[PDB]
Structure 1
């Protein structure tokens, strides 16, 4: 069983890739080829983004996938098979690349922004969520202190409505 089901939407392919590669070690090995592939796609503005279009022919889709894999052994591992399978199954998997990254984080990294009344963009890369959270929050407050602005606490709206409606 994967760390948590990603609720589909072309995330089925990524979920299956995570499960199969988790049968093997294929964890950093899987994510590394994916990161290289995504970087390569970004490295070609066109022919790698316009290549992520439905209009690409089946021969064209297989050829584009093969050419992307042609960047030496940057397409090493089961990611090659997944890319070829998608080449006819579903053309667009950049979101599937991000989902593979999400699965990798779920396997190893975890963590997401808390929120509540803060709009901060931090991270807490630790399995536990009962110790490091406070340290991460205080650090991100005392270091950087970027645009975490929710404008104001919604309780202002709460009190305003509460008083304004008897």
Structure 2
């Protein structure tokens, strides 16, 4: 068996069944953030195009899935007991699905002990707290100028479409 852990993010199923494993596996031993900032650097040294198709080549033939990161980033110490799960991902073909594991992992990994919202007619109200609407009043203390009518707008809509909606 294992033990379920989730520090905020948190998807459940389809990579989210997966993330919640290394979530208890990295959070046990607490190599979690050491592997976040690992996985973050790897999020782009992977995603590239010197390779569009040489660190994420899946196939032209299988050989990549034999090992290409079981061997090219186990060519990196990066990922040194979480590079086993990338080797699984490399064999198991989900190697293009990593962006949502790492997004789950990092919007996981910050916000991993944090809270994001966005109410009505704000939109960058998107942060990492432990308490709420004391903090988003602190965003109205950026200046209450600039907010709750733009970015995303009480103009047509909240307020403006509601008097149209009564008819």
TM-score scaled to structure 1, two decimals?
0.75
Number of equivalenced pairs: 157
Q: Give the aligned partner of residue 26 of structure 2.
A: 21
Q: 1:53 to 1:86 in 2, by over 3 A?
A: same
- Give structure 1 stretches of 5+ with no counterpart: none
Q: Give the aligned partner of residue 157 of structure 2.
A: 153
Higher helix residue share: 1
Using CA pairs below 8 Å that are at least 6 residues apart, which structure has the higher relative contact order?
1
Q: Give the aligned partner of residue 162 of structure 1.
A: 166
Q: 1:130 to 1:122 in 2, by over 3 A?
A: closer
Query: How big is the shift at 1:62?
Result: 4.5
Q: Give the aligned partner of residue 38 of structure 1.
A: 43
Q: 1:59 to 1:148 in 2, by over 3 A?
A: same
TM-score scaled to structure 2, two decimals?
0.74
Give me the whole-angstrom Cα distance separating, in 1, the residues matched to 2:139 and 2:22: 32
Does 2:124 match 1:121?
Answer: yes
Give me the whole-angstrom Cα distance separating, in 2, the residues matched to 1:2 and 1:111: 14
Q: Give the aligned partner of residue 64 of structure 1.
A: 68
- Give structure 2 stretches of 5+ with no counterpart: none
